[PDB]
Design a protein around this ligand. Structure first.
Ligand SMILES: COc1ccc(CNc2ccc(CN3CCN(C)CC3)cc2)cc1
Ligand SMILES: COc1ccc(CNc2ccc(CN3CCN(C)CC3)cc2)cc1
Ligand SMILES: COc1ccc(CNc2ccc(CN3CCN(C)CC3)cc2)cc1
Ligand SMILES: CCCCCCCCCCCCCC(=O)O
Ligand SMILES: CCCCCCCCCCCCCC(=O)O
Ligand SMILES: CCCCCCCCCCCCCC(=O)O
Lengths: 238, 251, 283, 59, 238, 283, 59, 283, 59, 60
């Protein structure tokens, strides 16, 4: 017949190949298609939805739900820190298990900007201002508000609109960053400080809580599929 | 003003004067089944106004120590007006829903609730293995309470709140159609759910289409007032309901 | 054309960044209200000065087709060529996707799935240890049989049921490439369901959960006629690879470890790991 | 009967490949891993009334 | 020659493949074709023919032919049941071995409507009316005629036309049903009741018989070939 | 065209359901008479109100071509490379389709059949047990010989008849893909007959039944020249696969178990299984 | 010498495949498992006089 | 076209030699000044009489594509089918190109490189010596697993991590052609860097050199299920072959021998070999 | 979809070869080892002012 | 299928061959290209640059 010669790679089984194969059930009639609501075509669509971030990981939380709320008090020194965290969406315990971190943990590289949304859940009569800042990578994280305000930041005024958005820009030397972030691909820090202080009238609770939401922007993307390290087994399930 | 809403189904009306927008399922509005997707051959029955109307689903108390509640549909309406009768007498059913949750408090209270509709909310038992009857998670319109500590009774579901009874992070329920009730801003929440399933119709007694959950993320707090609790009420209205397969009643 | 038809796809690319200057106005893009269930659509251009950037990044590798288009192991078992126990000389597996944790979790990120399937079989053999191993045995041959629900099931390695006249089968000889085939969408419903919150009986009794909808059949394997003087053990691995995938209704990834192959049962798990205090940012 | 279509870019950038089907069942074809359409509005903007980003949300 | 590489599945023998192979008798002259009467091109053509249903399986039938006839009597209570059966064409003993059940047992899935035809084989002077009802799946089969009449039914009047047809509609939640039916894919029940009662003049037998015929409609179809469990062997035939 | 010709088939689809309303008239579609030998053509639309339904189900998998187009085993036998008995070192099978029950029953649903055939051979070998098994043997080779009726038949493994000059043969080496070939319609009559209600002699005497029309030849198999110091046993399996099938005069499927390979003989069997009483409907 | 014809539908619904014959005997071709014509009248309506479903059978 | 498109390249050929005659002028092509950093462009035609010569020599084989387009070994290691030490039954290699001297030096002639990669695996097995070697073992099978950075790593030969659902893998059976695949440009930066004169921490501390930018992942290998009664040792060799290469900023070839796999450390070496005196020209 | 291009000369001097791509990724293509453009001015003449070979360099 | 026969050289691994092979990372998005200064396309370009010659090898 037609002369041929086999090249390297013949008879190998590569788990990510694309080849045609015979059908074991010839002329099988499949069930007609139906347009079920809520079709998802790309995982970034899932990644772009907000999810509550457990910022309050203080190592002595006897109640798990306490992790989601950030405490706030009426009387505090003029400049004081509300919270601080590292911007490692796929590695930091804060973002590790969120709806965005779970998607990232299936991939090796990521790039793009992020949205952090903060919502004030105090009384309607309470008021205050907060300074939320993003500090790009450096040798030392900010220690005071004076330091924090030198980076990207927004002044948040609490009023009828209960929510404010800090958009973390994509500032990097490389087009992509590793999910298993190392010192070479650091991403910076995020901190929140009192701007004016929280004031309340008579007959209101003396403490309030804030919550944080994390999601990706429309320029976010991922690359290089890999297996997630969060799930494992020791024996075959039965 | 866009903070006022009015909804009219059948011979019932809902008015809210301090509310957020309306969430519509996955962007799809409820509708009747088409001719090119049906499988059953006999003529459907469409009661219309007799069934598509608002029903008030009893009431509960929000305390400082509350953890959360859930309802399973359409079981929650199994004995409510003519909707229950049509459920009993027919083999197949299909309908969308409008869910309205009322909760009002003064300007001096604080707290936040998550209202979410979970399709196919399969739940696990308290003791791995074993089994539980269909009374540990649905007994009519009565609400079932989550638990702060891990459940121990083998006859009921694992009610640990932080896992939502499904083995998933409670904080990720934002992926489903949802809305928040924050006492500073709004006093109601409205969700329109289309019919979601893998088949055109299904038996309404055997299968739970979706589960409604109300979870306090920020616990209620107040000081120096005579109001000790904040009631929460749930109202539901089937939409575009139709049935098929008449037989003897019961199910 | 007739001989050559030209298709045409297109690169998409993520959104570019537009130049933004100083602003002072009544518009407040940063302020919103999450109570509406609406995720904010702000971009860095709306809260700080930015330069014009032309992005060429694409989301090609994040599609569900590529996400689920990887072969993953779903089952392995061992069977011996000769032994005293009849049941230990062949395998019989009720098909399901809940046995192996990784692919199970990948699938359960969606509620309903619809796809064609590509199945690959990897078979290896080894001689069992013993006091005397010197033998000469030709190459072995294996048979894989698929029995749709309700069909006859073999009860022994040399039963009559192995003479398939209508059940599909594959005969494979060791030393060649692994066996492979394609399977269409074989569900009675309009889509596969990973979760089923319902009962089997109409009065809410009986089996509960996805166990009720698993009626995909069985797979059987044997040595065709090999029966060595000394025992030989073979292991088969089954790999699934979805094709032409469609998915609906995403749901959050599981947090707790799996404990049963046909149940959602679990043990409560902490939300995440802890740190010294809310301000700790160092390693 | 032969389809000609572009192949994904690579380093150093006839960027064309040829495909023919050999089997009578559409299930035998190779994966269609070159569709890149997406629309997140179903999950990010499920509200009824359109919201303008520049305007205030509630009133 | 032309470079090539083998993919998975080479050298396998799949019993349902479609490939060309060499002919062992080149240039063989086949006998001319002849148009024999009664060509069958599709098994559904066979499945659409009526066949007698053995409804009378009363566990004490000393004569096998008695299975095909359903007894009827002149004096009976005002409401009484003639027969009852489950609608499992491929699994129920009643339909298992009929001309339709045999075809179904070679397949795994089925769908479509069915025809049940009843013929009265009494005397020409006998008369009566019967109510034949189909009850879709439910938690309890009907116990009385009052229950039965709530479902699909037809009132059969015995006269010059000896036969009546109950067409069982296709009412199901899924496009297809399993032949090895389980509780999930139940199909319902069929029952027959006295409507008025059987009346006879003097000089006629006091008992009569009915027979049932089963066949598929023009929208019937099957899927997923499989081996039938009805036939087996223990040794090679000789 | 010349290079590419375009064929055109078509999906058929089952009949749709038309909308039907209330009726009150003299027409009686439900009432008929089976005495005419006519099967009623009523549809649910004729006895109850129905909605419009567009069916897309097709009867593709029920065609006789697909029903009979599956490879099924028809014969297996064993032969040894070396032994004292000459007759036990090779096989000799008179071709027929009545040996294996499943394919026999599939075929006997029709009275006359006309098709091409595709034959596949699966051969496996194993070493016989013994007190000493240590040997080195190269790969074995096998020969399959087809002898049309009236041709010479070999009487031993090394007979002259194995030098086929006109009988077709195949030489196959272990470790490769199974052998395969195609066979045309080789009947003297216009169609194969599964049943023959007649005799061989003109005065109604002699052989009776389908045994009279079976003159398809023989198949012989041997090891080409392998003769190991220690015995080795090989097994061959023959698979048939009809192609381009046509069938006439369907007949009811068999009910009784088979007992002879060349006769219809049987033992009486009950019509079906029993139940408690004519009203019992529960499990 | 190449035939082009449609292949059976599948999930997600170039639905074309190419075939060439290599051997000189028609018996060597692959199965023609794509013919779907059928006519049950030979077995369901073998009567001589046409019967109208709406009319009464005997007279 | 549509069926056939015609490409068109071109031979280049080196410069020809032009005829030159006697000259006497003020121009001085031979005299220049190297202080400018300019390499003189004089040709023999500018300093002596020459004939016309038409050269057909081409520099085809000196291109970087051809220079670097040869497969070269980058790693080899051994693993045993059965042993008491768990760590010795599989391999785990952090991917890098500094292990083997020849290809390392070929690559380090450039500062930045950008190319696709073609990887080939050569696997061989041998039986370990011992007092008793008589055994019969079927053909072995091997698995090669690639784990991008941050993924789970197997800790033993039969760990769960080997059930790759997303990590690419290859299963290869002995006796066939070597395994092979293609890899795109997988660097986070715009080009691979052979050298990196910098630190990891921002305050100039921590790791130094190219060790900081090596985050390409790992490769794991094992016997799928082979476990012989007697030990068997297998060796794997990995070959890299750049494709579609581009290079920037050439640098002088290394003179000193290599001493570390992740450092430039060296021992001083003489510039070149010596000779008797500056006038010695004989052997 | 088939490219036709000349192949390198050899002894005794249809000097044409045909190529078709089978895979959907450009990284799967064969090496492009037939480009022969080169320009040494970047390394041999990196000076700013153009220098004429026949003229004196410095002044 | 299509009859064929293998010729000498099948299944060999020649280190200087040019064949297509499957991609292990389908649809991978490579980083955009950037024009770094000083691209070298042929080794003769390197060879044409001057370098100091160590002529004084006097063994002491
Ligand atoms: C015969 O060759 C075969 C046979 C079967 C298979 C497996 N096919 C398969 C397996 C799993 C799902 C997903 N379904 C999700 C809902 N769950 C209740 C059942 C499984 C779909 C198809 C492969 C090859
Ligand atoms: C030589 O390669 C061969 C030779 C023979 C065969 C078998 N060919 C064959 C077998 C059976 C029927 C059906 N006939 C039905 C009526 N019965 C009396 C005889 C058998 C037709 C052809 C295959 C390959
Ligand atoms: C998974 O199949 C694979 C995986 C990895 C590889 C190796 N790929 C590779 C190796 C080396 C360089 C050159 N880089 C130079 C700068 N140095 C810091 C890192 C290496 C590029 C790619 C092959 C196949
Ligand atoms: C079963 C089909 C085998 C096809 C073999 C490869 C193609 C050979 C013909 C050359 C391409 C032309 C195809 C066409 O005309 O559409
Ligand atoms: C014995 C025939 C071998 C055919 C080999 C495959 C086809 C090669 C030619 C390309 C297709 C064109 C066929 C035609 O012209 O009809
Ligand atoms: C996956 C592609 C397989 C291609 C097989 C070889 C080419 C067969 C068709 C003959 C060449 C024509 C190609 C074309 O029309 O562009």
């Amino acid at each position: 017949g037609l002369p041929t010669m086999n090249t390297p790679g013949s008879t190998q089984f590569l788990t990510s190949d694309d080849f045609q194969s015979p059908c074991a059930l010839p002329q099988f009639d499949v069930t007609p298609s139906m347009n079920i609501p809520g079709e998802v075509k790309n995982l970034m669509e899932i990644a772009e939805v907000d999810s509550v971030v457990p910022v309050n990981n203080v190592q002595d939380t006897t109640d798990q739900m306490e992790m989601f709320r950030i405490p706030v008090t009426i009387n505090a020194p003029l400049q004081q820190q509300v919270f601080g965290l590292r911007l490692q969406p796929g590695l930091d315990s804060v973002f590790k298990h969120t709806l965005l971190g779970e998607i990232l943990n299936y991939y090796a590289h990521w790039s793009g900007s992020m949205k952090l949304t903060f919502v004030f859940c105090g009384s309607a009569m309470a008021t205050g201002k907060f300074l939320i800042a993003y500090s790009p990578p450096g040798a030392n994280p900010p220690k005071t508000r004076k330091d924090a305000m030198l980076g990207t930041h927004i002044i948040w005024d609490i009023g009828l609109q209960s929510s404010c958005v800090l958009c973390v820009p994509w500032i990097s030397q490389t087009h992509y960053r590793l999910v298993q972030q190392d010192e070479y691909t650091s991403a910076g820090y995020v901190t929140c400080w009192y701007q004016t202080g929280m004031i309340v009238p008579p007959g209101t609770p003396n403490s309030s809580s804030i919550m944080c939401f994390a999601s990706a922007c429309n320029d976010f993307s991922v690359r290089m599929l890999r297996d997630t390290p969060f799930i494992s087994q020791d024996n075959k399930l039965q | 003003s866009d903070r006022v809403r009015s909804i009219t189904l059948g011979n019932s009306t809902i008015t809210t004067q301090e509310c957020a927008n309306v969430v519509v399922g996955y962007g799809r509005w409820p509708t009747y089944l088409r001719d090119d997707e049906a499988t059953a051959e006999d003529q459907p029955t469409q009661p219309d106004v007799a069934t598509c109307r608002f029903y008030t689903l009893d009431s509960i108390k929000w305390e400082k120590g509350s953890v959360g509640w859930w309802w399973k549909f359409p079981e929650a309406l199994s004995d409510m007006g003519l909707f229950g009768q049509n459920m009993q007498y027919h083999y197949l059913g299909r309908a969308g829903y409008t869910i309205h949750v009322q909760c009002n408090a003064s300007k001096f209270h604080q707290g936040c609730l998550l209202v979410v509709c979970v399709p196919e909310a399969e739940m696990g038992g308290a003791v791995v293995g074993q089994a539980f009857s269909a009374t540990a998670m649905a007994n009519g319109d009565k609400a079932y309470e989550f638990t702060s500590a891990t459940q121990s009774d083998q006859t009921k579901v694992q009610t640990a709140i932080h896992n939502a009874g499904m083995g998933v992070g409670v904080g990720n329920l934002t992926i489903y159609p949802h809305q928040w009730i924050n006492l500073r801003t709004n006093n109601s929440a409205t969700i329109v759910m289309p019919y979601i399933n893998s088949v055109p119709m299904d038996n309404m007694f055997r299968h739970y289409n979706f589960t409604l959950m109300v979870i306090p993320f920020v616990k209620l707090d107040y000081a120096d007032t005579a109001s000790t609790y904040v009631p929460i009420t749930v109202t539901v209205a089937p939409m575009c309901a139709e049935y098929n397969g008449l037989r003897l009643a019961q199910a | 054309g007739d001989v050559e038809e030209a298709i045409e796809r297109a690169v998409v690319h993520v959104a570019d960044t537009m130049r933004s200057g100083p602003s002072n106005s009544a518009s407040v893009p940063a302020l919103t209200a999450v109570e509406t269930g609406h995720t904010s659509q702000v971009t860095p251009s709306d809260t700080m000065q930015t330069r014009h950037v032309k992005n060429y990044h694409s989301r090609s590798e994040s599609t569900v087709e590529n996400f689920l288009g990887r072969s993953a192991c779903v089952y392995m078992e061992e069977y011996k060529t000769t032994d005293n126990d009849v049941n230990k000389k062949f395998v019989a597996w009720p098909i399901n996707t809940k046995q192996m944790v990784q692919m199970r979790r990948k699938l359960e990120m969606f509620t309903y799935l619809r796809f064609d399937m590509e199945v690959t079989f990897v078979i290896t053999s080894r001689q069992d240890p013993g006091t005397t191993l010197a033998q000469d045995m030709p190459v072995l041959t294996h048979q894989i049989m698929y029995v749709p629900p309700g069909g006859p099931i073999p009860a022994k390695v040399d039963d009559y049921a192995w003479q398939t006249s209508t059940n599909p089968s594959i005969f494979w000889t060791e030393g060649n490439a692994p066996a492979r085939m394609s399977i269409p969408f074989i569900s009675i419903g309009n889509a596969y369901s990973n979760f089923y919150d319902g009962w089997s009986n109409f009065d809410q009794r009986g089996s509960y959960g996805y166990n009720t909808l698993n009626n995909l059949g069985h797979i059987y394997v044997r040595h065709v006629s090999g029966s060595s003087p000394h025992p030989i053990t073979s292991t088969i691995r089954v790999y699934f690879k979805p094709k032409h995938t469609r998915a609906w209704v995403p749901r959050p990834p599981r947090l707790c470890q799996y404990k049963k192959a046909f149940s959602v049962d679990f043990t409560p798990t902490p939300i995440t790991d802890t740190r010294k205090d809310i301000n700790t940012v160092t390693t | 009967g032969a389809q000609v279509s572009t192949q994904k870019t690579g380093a150093h950038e006839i960027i064309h490949y040829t495909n023919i089907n050999y089997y009578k069942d559409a299930a035998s074809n190779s994966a269609n891993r070159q569709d890149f359409t997406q629309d997140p509005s179903k999950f990010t903007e499920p509200v009824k009334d359109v919201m303008i980003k520049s305007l205030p949300a509630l009133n």
